[PDB]
Write a protein that binds this ligand. Structure first.
Ligand code: 29L
Ligand code: 29L
Lengths: 223, 275, 230, 283
């Protein structure tokens, strides 16, 4: 019910108030506006939904672990499960919002390659997030779409982007953990992770320093 | 002598706690200072021995991780004066306020403490009461070991940090460098555990009785999940039942320092985060 | 439905850090009418303290942005309207808790421990309403905060030892009321220093668990006294 | 054998710079240490007496705002070893990175420096080279006054010194070299005045001037004084008055460090609090 500038201002204000549900709503309206987002607006949408869905992922992991360690108690296990599926539903709704925005606005209105690899990566990450909680009859489908979008972005990633480039470095990180976690293909995942790290060492200044540490931690722990 | 403070120069402020042989206040003397003071009217000959022994030990200490002794006073009543440390004791943050420290900060605290007692043992100083209560935090930046009232130079009720041989006291002097290493092992237990050891046993005499025989040892499974495996092994090494299987502080310090280097951000797989 | 199922789902919401869910569970448990247990009391307290703390922090941030925005008249209008959204949430949370206190908790408190704990909670939530109230209802809310604090203080000094953690916490929060709300540092330091000094005397007395409980609040009193005299 | 450290125990690392009478490196000795050392095979009687005086002075310093002396060595070369300070000198922060210090932290830095020089003068120690480079920030939080090579105990037979290039902090009497003792407690107070100038303006004094050698002559003369009009507006009025008091041209009207300290302590309490009170947390 307001200007794109008014919604972006309320989004930045919600970000500093750490009210990520408000920021997500603002950026959702701004994207339903139809215009290509700027790097700042893109970045705000990313921060918003990542925090919104990360809270639910953290709660899901905690409550699932509690479900596991419930021994000799149905009703304890019954409460944890039903709570896990409540969080699970929230988890799905968030990702469905984000994937609908990705498919109806973000990827199609991306002019340069940078934007469309970023949005396809996000596409892969949210299908991935869906992946973690998928049941199994529909699990397969979601995982398939995750890697399809991921790799489609991957194909364009190391073709127009410099080895130091963080969107690229991050896409690899997410694609590698996609293979390692979601599926179980450590070799491919480890292949990818070491490949990207060494190509980065070969050739943002502070941004890349920390993504290479995340790559070095990953391989150290994966092997 | 050259460390005595004339009476009248120190303004003693609020009473903030207790120490080995006296009560501790905050004071002003060219800034802030901590003052441990025995309030007895006429010190008895044992109290003057304790006080001058503590001063003698402290005037041999000059290290960033030792509570810096600044002077002493005797005029109104006997008093030891140190630098002021605004954060509380490690015991406070761990077991009374449960300040959630990151594992990186816990490793740094253990590392600094290890430096402090490497310095101490290298000058032949045995503390004999090392515990998280005697470890002070200075503005969440430096660790400082304090209260040397029970310390000594080795010359020819805090039970949970006492090594088994010290509980038995069957030997004339059970305290040694190794006993200190065992207390350090218990402090590492607190850092990597979040809890004091033997949380299930209720009474003090029972716990003394069982650790002295060896029936009871700390439960290491209660170590937090992100604790580096080298640190857990080092705790095991510092806590071995038999004194001579324990490492020396140069070796403890070197491995914790090496160990502090290379610590991962988090334990499991990690995805890109910009937020 | 069961009270124990609500307590267990409250603990599970606490583990997942979904404090709105924990608050709802505990509100259901307190609306059943029975006197709460010590654990149930502390779960309700923790839940609403987190629920309202999120809003207090966000309110402070956007309020600060509101006053510090000069040039832009439209931006300052947006920060004002978002501050009022957060404020409305804040007030609803506090009114929820104060209704729970008045209707169930305070009347059902048999023991003195319980009645000082709940009157102090009443003082805290009226104090949170005082932190954002402006002009008209401000005086009424400040008075209700002080009144609840004062009654709990008198009952603390008459049936609780100086080291009792509830009395020490009442001292801490009442001194913070004096400093931040009434803007009277001297009276705040007087109350804080008295409670801390009276506890330090008897600190040697306590068991090792009682000492952890008491020292956790005494360190906060001395931190406050250090900040207020500096 | 009092504070002497045996040879072989100290692992000396990278060269970090120079100090008064030696070059400074990083070292390992029960943790990190700083080492001021003289890179010579055989010390002359003058370098050996200078080193002996500095150890004698440092052995009397035991204060949080004085760089903690930890020991000395004679064996390979003469060396003074101190605590290590991660961070930079205040000179580096103010004029080499323009680290944006808040006025509150600037007040605190001045207060800690004042505590250090209060301690020093109460033990009859004159530093005689107090400058922003000899003030080190440990963990960008704590001030540590260092480099005691030109320091002395106030004695009848005091001293005898390489004043060199760092002369901005030198008081007019020290520039003129015409009175009984050009160095004194008041010379230290004027050096302190200059470091508050740096703290409150952000720049060195006599910065905007055309010629450089005469500058001395002008300060010596009394012709030139720091431009107190470049103090920033958020600098408290008591602090600007106090710095003027520490910079006054005739020694005897400058204040002493007990009351400088009391004034910095009192005015620091009148600045708005940056934090809020703490309330009872969740059990
Ligand atoms: O543990 C909480 C109570 N508490 C006790 C002390 C304490 C304990 C022993 C000693 C000193 C102070 C000084 C002299 C001494 N031993 O000789 C402190 C403290 C230490 C350093 N800075 C500020 C406070 N807090
Ligand atoms: O201009 C900056 C170069 N720089 C010089 C020193 C220094 C200066 C004098 C002295 C020592 C170290 C140690 C002994 C001594 N005086 O006797 C330091 C420093 C001091 C403390 N921690 C880290 C570095 N940096």
């Amino acid at each position: 019910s307001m200007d794109k500038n008014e919604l972006v201002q309320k989004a930045k204000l919600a970000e500093q108030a750490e009210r990520y549900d408000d920021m997500a709503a603002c950026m959702k309206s701004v994207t339903e506006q139809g215009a290509e987002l700027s790097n700042e607006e893109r970045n705000l949408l990313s921060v918003a939904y990542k925090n919104v869905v990360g809270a639910r992922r953290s709660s899901w992991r905690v409550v699932s672990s509690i479900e596991q360690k419930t021994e000799g108690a149905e009703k304890k296990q019954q409460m944890a499960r039903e709570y896990r599926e409540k969080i699970e539903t929230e988890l799905r709704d968030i990702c469905n919002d984000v994937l609908s925005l990705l498919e109806k606005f973000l990827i199609p209105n991306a002019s340069q390659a940078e934007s469309k690899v970023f949005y396809l990566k996000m596409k892969g990450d949210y299908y991935r997030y869906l992946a973690e909680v998928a049941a199994g009859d529909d699990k397969k489908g979601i995982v398939d779409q995750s890697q399809q979008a991921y790799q489609e972005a991957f194909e364009i990633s190391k073709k127009e982007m410099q080895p130091t480039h963080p969107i690229r470095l991050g896409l690899a990180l997410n694609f590698s953990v996609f293979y390692y976690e979601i599926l179980n293909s450590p070799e491919k995942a480890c292949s990818l992770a070491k490949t990207a790290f060494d190509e980065a060492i070969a050739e943002s200044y502070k941004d890349s320093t920390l993504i290479m540490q995340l790559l070095r931690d990953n391989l150290t722990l994966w092997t | 002598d050259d460390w005595e403070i004339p009476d009248g120069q120190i303004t003693v402020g609020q009473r903030i706690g207790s120490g080995s042989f006296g009560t501790v206040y905050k004071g002003k003397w060219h800034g802030d200072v901590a003052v441990k003071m025995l309030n007895v009217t006429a010190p008895t000959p044992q109290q003057l021995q304790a006080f001058k022994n503590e001063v003698g030990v402290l005037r041999k200490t000059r290290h960033v991780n030792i509570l810096l002794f600044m002077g002493y006073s005797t005029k109104p009543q006997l008093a030891i004066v140190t630098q002021w440390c605004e954060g509380s004791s490690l015991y406070h943050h761990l077991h009374a306020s449960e300040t959630k420290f990151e594992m990186k900060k816990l490793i740094d605290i253990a590392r600094q403490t290890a430096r402090g007692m490497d310095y101490l043992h290298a000058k032949s100083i045995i503390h004999r009461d090392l515990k998280s209560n005697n470890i002070f935090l200075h503005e969440d930046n430096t660790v400082k070991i304090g209260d040397f009232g029970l310390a000594t130079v080795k010359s020819r009720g805090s039970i949970l940090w006492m090594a088994p041989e010290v509980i038995r006291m069957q030997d004339s002097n059970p305290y040694s460098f190794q006993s200190d290493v065992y207390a350090f092992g218990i402090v590492l237990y607190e850092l990597m555990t979040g809890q004091l050891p033997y949380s299930n046993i209720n009474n003090r005499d029972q716990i003394i009785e069982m650790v002295g025989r060896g029936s009871l040892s700390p439960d290491l499974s209660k170590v937090r999940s992100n604790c580096p495996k080298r640190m857990k092994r080092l705790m095991a090494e510092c806590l071995k039942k038999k004194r001579d299987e324990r490492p020396s502080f140069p070796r403890i310090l070197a491995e914790i320092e090496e160990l502090a280097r290379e610590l991962p951000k988090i334990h499991r797989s990690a995805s890109e985060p910009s937020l």
